[PDB]
């Protein structure tokens, strides 16, 4: 859900309290999905935000 907040201009919990990008960003953003590797059958609880 919070992938479009990575782009500059947008606002949100992640975009303003954890990671903010400048309005003159001249780079690239790479995103992919990995559910089985990052989570076991019981779920992952070592991630903080």
């Amino acid at each position, epitope marked *: 859900d919070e992938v*479009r907040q990575i*782009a500059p*201009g*947008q606002t949100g919990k992640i975009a303003d309290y954890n990671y903010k990008l400048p309005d003159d960003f001249t780079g690239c953003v790479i995103a992919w*999905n990995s559910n089985n590797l990052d989570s076991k059958v019981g779920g992952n609880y070592n991630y903080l935000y």
Partner: antibody
Amino acid sequence: EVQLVESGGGLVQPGGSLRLSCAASGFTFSSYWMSWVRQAPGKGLEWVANIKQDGSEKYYVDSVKGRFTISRDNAKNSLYLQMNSLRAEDTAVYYCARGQLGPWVGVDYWGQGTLVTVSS
Amino acid sequence: NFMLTQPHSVSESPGKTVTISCTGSSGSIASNYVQWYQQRPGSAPTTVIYEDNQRPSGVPDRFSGSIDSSSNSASLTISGLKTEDEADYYCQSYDSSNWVFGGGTQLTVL
């Protein structure tokens, strides 16, 4: 200039097999992306398939999942498309699509295509 | 279930600036690149817009495009409205390992 020649249709068959081939020239075959696109006569465009520059990864739409297969070779610069268990919906005009960097930049390439009709 | 919604018959006007709107519903179309394609009825299609802001070599600069994120829609604008051949246009995006195409927007009377 890039020339794309397609000649794989011109006959009808219910639920059999048909092979389509697209011939390409004027560019390196083993460095870019290619795809396949079809459209119904009088209807809009829709996507069929895509293939990597070495044929390792191939993908399809859920409507043609289970059937369909695509193969390639860089020696003679050609594309192969095999269809099996065709239906009446498959009356479409097929263009061999060629990409530039990936599935994000765009298609930008469309051959003249071949008229394909199916009758039972 | 990503799709794109666009009208079927717009821009029926002589010689001024009009806009064509392409929007999606399942996800945000601003995450990935969206392009505009045109086809000549009875022959091969071409492309007017790639990379959501750029044009092919030889394509006139009359065409213009923009993206709005408030309504999550893609806007294609044509300025000259010349004697260009009748055609219909499509809207293409990319969700995950698949391609989605628009319904089509006929434009015959210029």
